[PDB]
Structure 1
């Protein structure tokens, strides 16, 4: 409820303004919660950051699992559905960024050990799901053989970099480059 409302409002604003660039008041005002309530549920802005990041990964990873077990698609189709979504809902009429790994990693990495680790574990979990799907495709013939752990990492790295350049250009341009390199890397 109130805690969850704060987490949501936080995610919504930090996705755009970052961690250091928002103040508790803006989050608070935008959510209609008093400062004393904020500090009833979180001991600090840092601890709040972590919570929002954990909740973010729980939700993100749930979706990845659902996606990589969708009925009626083979593994390749499942894997590509993920990259396509990344490319699709990132045409740049979208300012409110979806991806906290892209938005917060570099800022937060030297600032909060708890947020650094949460981002770190969260990304590893993302990579983990990719490894499974890559593996599933080696079972159903959808995908060529490869070192699934290496491939998932390299692809994920490639798409992360694309998102940076994408934000830098306000173009989905670099993501198209990513998609294309991905098709090339698989098969």
Structure 2
């Protein structure tokens, strides 16, 4: 229970203030968990950060596997519903930036090397499924030919950038632009 309570409280804090500007002290009084009880689950603030990331990429990559493997859907449909998921998981007007590549990639220089290695890996793992799914649509005729490596990265950048700007402006506008653009570049 309390391990997970710390992890969920780690995420909510992480979504608003990042990881490196946040004392363990802050995490602790936000979780309402005592210090002693923290060191029973995690060796460190740094290791608690790894756990959070690790946990974050697993849930995220698994959802992407489920979706990009959904029977009865072509590669266009599988891919589109992932972008829709992004557009619908975002709340422009909430303080929480739930997309950590966006949150943490902006703060990467003040992170440890281990955290940076995990963040690039998680991030490479998203692009890679995007490439897979693009390549798969060329096989079932669902998507017009393209350089799939190039397209995947182009699309991911576009959406990261819209996440970033959506949060600045507390507005849905930039994610709508990302979607509209994604429809044009595809089909």
Note the residue ranges of structure 2 that are not aligned, 5 or more in a row: none
Unaligned stretches of 5+ residues in structure 1: none
Contact 1:166 1:175 in 2 (8 A): yes
Deviation at 1:97, TM superposition (A): 2.4
Separation (CA, whole Å) in 2 of partners of 1:159 and 1:128 = 16
User: Given that residues 102 and 164 in structure 2 are in contact (C-alpha distance below 8 angstroms), is that contact kept between their aligned partners in structure 1?
Assistant: yes
Q: Is the 8 A contact 2:61 2:126 kept in 1?
A: yes
TM-score, length-normalised on structure 1? 0.91
TM-score (norm 2): 0.91
Report SS of the residue matched to 1:125: helix
Q: In 1, Cα distance between the equivalents of 2:29 and 2:69?
A: 40
1:133 deviation in Å?
Answer: 0.9
Aligned pair count reads 187
**Cα displacement (A) at 1:148:** 1.3
Q: Distance in 2 between matches of 1:172 and 1:134?
A: 26
Distance 1:95 1:110, change over 3 A: closer
SS at match of 2:39: helix
1:19–1:108 CA contact under 8 A, matched in 2 = no
1:150-187 per-position Cα deviation (integer Å, ceiling 9, x unaligned): 11111101111111111111111111111112112112
TM superposition outliers: structure 1 runs of 4+ over 3 Å: none
